[PDB]
Amino acid sequence: CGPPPPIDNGGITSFPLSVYAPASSVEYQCANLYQLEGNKRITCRNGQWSEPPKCLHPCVISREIMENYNIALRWTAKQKLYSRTGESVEFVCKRGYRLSSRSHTLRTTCWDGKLEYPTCAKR
Amino acid sequence: MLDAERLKHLIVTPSGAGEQNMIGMTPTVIAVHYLDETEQWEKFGLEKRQGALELIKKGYTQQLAFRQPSSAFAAFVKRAPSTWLTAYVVKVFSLAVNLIAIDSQVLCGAVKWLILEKQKPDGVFQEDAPVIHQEMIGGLRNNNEKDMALTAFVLISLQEAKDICEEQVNSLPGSITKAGDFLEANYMNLQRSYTVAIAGYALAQMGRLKGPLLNKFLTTAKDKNRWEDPGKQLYNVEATSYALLALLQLKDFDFVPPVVRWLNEQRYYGGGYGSTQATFMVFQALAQYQKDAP
Amino acid sequence: MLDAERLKHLIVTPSGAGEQNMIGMTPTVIAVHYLDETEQWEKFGLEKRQGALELIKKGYTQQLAFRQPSSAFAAFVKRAPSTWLTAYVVKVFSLAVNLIAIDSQVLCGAVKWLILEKQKPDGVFQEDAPVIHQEMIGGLRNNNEKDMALTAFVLISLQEAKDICEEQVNSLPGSITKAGDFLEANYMNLQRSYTVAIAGYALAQMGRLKGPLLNKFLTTAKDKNRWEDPGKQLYNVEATSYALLALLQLKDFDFVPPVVRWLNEQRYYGGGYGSTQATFMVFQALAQYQKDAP
């Protein structure tokens, strides 16, 4: 086993080195607000590394985008909101707007960098 | 070129805890840097170089006592880690590796902590435990437009450490880009001359200082020789040094002469309470100028 | 579209007590509201928005110092609560909800007190402790048809808070209907253009502006472009603004253009003595108009 694989938005918790084989285990951590998916630990055996984990993306919610949807955050932290993978976010329609037909909720969940923005139409 | 003889005082022995040790380390490191690049060791006394080096080694060694297991730094081992200080250590060590033997693990470990712990998803860096010595952070002390200024400061540190750490820290290039993203998206709303200077150097380093942005950076200079704001004049020395380094990046050699002259006109020689950023920055830029003579 | 640059003076830091704080809060909230709706933060400058938001937080926060246990407001904690002030606070806060964090407890608690403590069984809202700054209430100062003018003003605040408060205040929809009942009952007996304009808008929101009532309202406009009475023009600016908002509620797009023309032709950008209501009302009406452009 040579050097452990790289993962996006993460890194091994230890100072890398070029000679491992075998039995060796390295651990990964993700960047702030990213969510580790898979076993934190990878191991060396038979020359190959066992599959490393991956870092599920958070979502960053901006007024810039929300404005296109005539929407705002319910618990008004900005303007800007970071939400981790798995966490739901609660919007309101902005003054003078209603949920709109093709939209089912003002509360949606972030998945690996994807969040549905509810549409609001205007009465 | 600031005459060697006017710099004898920048050679100091470092002391104190996690912040003060860096305050003393700074002048000596940047002084050896400037003297090397300007080739004034004859006018200064070559035999003095070795002694300065020993002082720098001493600074580096006692700084390691404030390295936390996470690889971050603070004034004291059990004070919450400072984003700013950790980046500042990266900035100094990343220069000092050329003067003395610095352990890559210490430097790149600080880099990985910054990246994996303190950068936000949109690329901004956040300070969660401000330094005690608010006088060592230069124009950042003015607390407003802080995301952009802190993000710029850290990004520059990261760019400084890139060639040294990219190997041990895979996430480095992506971190740099994402911070570049944030500075770019908001560079036009910048008001303070200080920020346009420091963010401008950060973007220029990447090649993202262009079009309207380039124009805005160039047209913030008063009299086309300095970047300044009302308030503490060290900030203006510092900011204008950032711009000099940015302009030097753009190869805009036809703009630098005034700026270089205004800086030399300041007759500023660094050192003293509150002089940390201005001292490091003034001598780094002019050093850069002297090696960039076409 | 009142040129953005011409609104710099509306960004003001709030100061003083229960009443004067609300007088400072007013130009700032409504200017930010207006620039949000007309999307003019580019002609005005996007970096100014964040500063203005801080000003709004300040006002809202220092206004809490004058909230009374009953959830109502007065200029001083020791002074009998004003019906009109409390209702105006609800109007301002309600319109700031997407701007800053407004505690539903403050908002709806004031709504509850208005209804359970200051509405009559017939529906009318009554002032038992008039504000000190009589210049901050615009056209309500003319003490004719007060029962109607006060009822409409308060009801309008209630309609503004309905969405957020209907859940926490069970009596709300009842109170709204009852006030409405009183309005249409005596609307035809109205003489003052101000009153027919502010009561008109109130009824129009519920759809209760119809038949002869709708007829009277429309025909009370002089030159079919303004609502007005002898006295200060500011009252007529305020009254024509309510009228305009009423027409929009009626989707009567055939009647508005002359109205919107007359207002713009008054060239009144807020500010000056006793400006509160004319400032809040004109910019609310003009913004609504831009949002409604088919």
PDB file of N, CA, C and O in Angstrom, chain A residues 8 16-17 26 29-31 35 37 43 46 54-55 63 65 75 101 110:
ATOM      1  N   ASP A   8     -12.458  14.562  -1.528  1.00  0.00           N
ATOM      2  CA  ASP A   8     -12.849  15.958  -1.640  1.00  0.00           C
ATOM      3  C   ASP A   8     -13.323  16.520  -0.300  1.00  0.00           C
ATOM      4  O   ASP A   8     -14.062  15.860   0.430  1.00  0.00           O
ATOM      5  N   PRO A  16       0.808  12.282   6.267  1.00  0.00           N
ATOM      6  CA  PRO A  16       0.938  11.250   5.230  1.00  0.00           C
ATOM      7  C   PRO A  16       2.371  10.744   5.096  1.00  0.00           C
ATOM      8  O   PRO A  16       3.321  11.429   5.471  1.00  0.00           O
ATOM      9  N   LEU A  17       2.516   9.538   4.559  1.00  0.00           N
ATOM     10  CA  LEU A  17       3.827   8.956   4.305  1.00  0.00           C
ATOM     11  C   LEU A  17       3.695   7.957   3.164  1.00  0.00           C
ATOM     12  O   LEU A  17       2.599   7.484   2.880  1.00  0.00           O
ATOM     13  N   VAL A  26      -5.500   4.344   8.196  1.00  0.00           N
ATOM     14  CA  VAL A  26      -5.509   5.800   8.208  1.00  0.00           C
ATOM     15  C   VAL A  26      -6.945   6.272   8.400  1.00  0.00           C
ATOM     16  O   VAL A  26      -7.879   5.604   7.962  1.00  0.00           O
ATOM     17  N   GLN A  29     -11.146  12.955   8.101  1.00  0.00           N
ATOM     18  CA  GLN A  29     -12.119  13.883   8.650  1.00  0.00           C
ATOM     19  C   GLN A  29     -12.559  14.797   7.514  1.00  0.00           C
ATOM     20  O   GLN A  29     -11.803  15.026   6.573  1.00  0.00           O
ATOM     21  N   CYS A  30     -13.782  15.309   7.587  1.00  0.00           N
ATOM     22  CA  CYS A  30     -14.273  16.225   6.568  1.00  0.00           C
ATOM     23  C   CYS A  30     -14.107  17.677   7.018  1.00  0.00           C
ATOM     24  O   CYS A  30     -13.910  17.952   8.197  1.00  0.00           O
ATOM     25  N   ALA A  31     -14.164  18.597   6.062  1.00  0.00           N
ATOM     26  CA  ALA A  31     -14.116  20.015   6.365  1.00  0.00           C
ATOM     27  C   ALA A  31     -15.345  20.429   7.161  1.00  0.00           C
ATOM     28  O   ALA A  31     -16.328  19.680   7.245  1.00  0.00           O
ATOM     29  N   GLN A  35     -20.250  16.334   5.963  1.00  0.00           N
ATOM     30  CA  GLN A  35     -20.690  15.164   6.695  1.00  0.00           C
ATOM     31  C   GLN A  35     -20.050  13.888   6.140  1.00  0.00           C
ATOM     32  O   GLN A  35     -20.302  13.503   4.996  1.00  0.00           O
ATOM     33  N   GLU A  37     -19.402  10.233   5.124  1.00  0.00           N
ATOM     34  CA  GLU A  37     -20.245   9.095   4.775  1.00  0.00           C
ATOM     35  C   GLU A  37     -19.390   7.873   4.444  1.00  0.00           C
ATOM     36  O   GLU A  37     -18.561   7.909   3.535  1.00  0.00           O
ATOM     37  N   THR A  43      -8.125   0.807   5.656  1.00  0.00           N
ATOM     38  CA  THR A  43      -7.037  -0.092   6.047  1.00  0.00           C
ATOM     39  C   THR A  43      -6.238  -0.652   4.866  1.00  0.00           C
ATOM     40  O   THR A  43      -6.731  -0.745   3.738  1.00  0.00           O
ATOM     41  N   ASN A  46      -3.155  -6.566   1.382  1.00  0.00           N
ATOM     42  CA  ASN A  46      -2.926  -7.150   0.060  1.00  0.00           C
ATOM     43  C   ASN A  46      -2.367  -6.157  -0.960  1.00  0.00           C
ATOM     44  O   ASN A  46      -2.287  -6.458  -2.153  1.00  0.00           O
ATOM     45  N   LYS A  54     -16.605   9.410   2.027  1.00  0.00           N
ATOM     46  CA  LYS A  54     -16.768  10.616   1.229  1.00  0.00           C
ATOM     47  C   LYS A  54     -17.485  11.706   2.020  1.00  0.00           C
ATOM     48  O   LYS A  54     -18.196  11.415   2.983  1.00  0.00           O
ATOM     49  N   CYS A  55     -17.287  12.960   1.626  1.00  0.00           N
ATOM     50  CA  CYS A  55     -17.818  14.077   2.412  1.00  0.00           C
ATOM     51  C   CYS A  55     -19.061  14.722   1.795  1.00  0.00           C
ATOM     52  O   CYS A  55     -18.969  15.500   0.850  1.00  0.00           O
ATOM     53  N   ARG A  63     -29.939  35.071   0.546  1.00  0.00           N
ATOM     54  CA  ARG A  63     -31.011  35.958   0.139  1.00  0.00           C
ATOM     55  C   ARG A  63     -31.002  36.108  -1.378  1.00  0.00           C
ATOM     56  O   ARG A  63     -32.057  36.185  -2.005  1.00  0.00           O
ATOM     57  N   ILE A  65     -30.499  34.068  -3.770  1.00  0.00           N
ATOM     58  CA  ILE A  65     -31.301  33.029  -4.404  1.00  0.00           C
ATOM     59  C   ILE A  65     -32.747  33.080  -3.931  1.00  0.00           C
ATOM     60  O   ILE A  65     -33.664  33.068  -4.742  1.00  0.00           O
ATOM     61  N   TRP A  75     -36.634  31.887  10.724  1.00  0.00           N
ATOM     62  CA  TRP A  75     -35.942  32.355  11.925  1.00  0.00           C
ATOM     63  C   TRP A  75     -34.701  33.167  11.513  1.00  0.00           C
ATOM     64  O   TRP A  75     -33.576  32.668  11.505  1.00  0.00           O
ATOM     65  N   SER A 101     -48.948  26.653  -6.260  1.00  0.00           N
ATOM     66  CA  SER A 101     -49.582  25.362  -6.516  1.00  0.00           C
ATOM     67  C   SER A 101     -48.625  24.174  -6.559  1.00  0.00           C
ATOM     68  O   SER A 101     -48.855  23.161  -5.902  1.00  0.00           O
ATOM     69  N   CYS A 110     -31.763  19.559   3.233  1.00  0.00           N
ATOM     70  CA  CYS A 110     -30.511  19.626   2.500  1.00  0.00           C
ATOM     71  C   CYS A 110     -29.912  18.223   2.340  1.00  0.00           C
ATOM     72  O   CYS A 110     -29.802  17.463   3.305  1.00  0.00           O
TER      73      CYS A 110
END
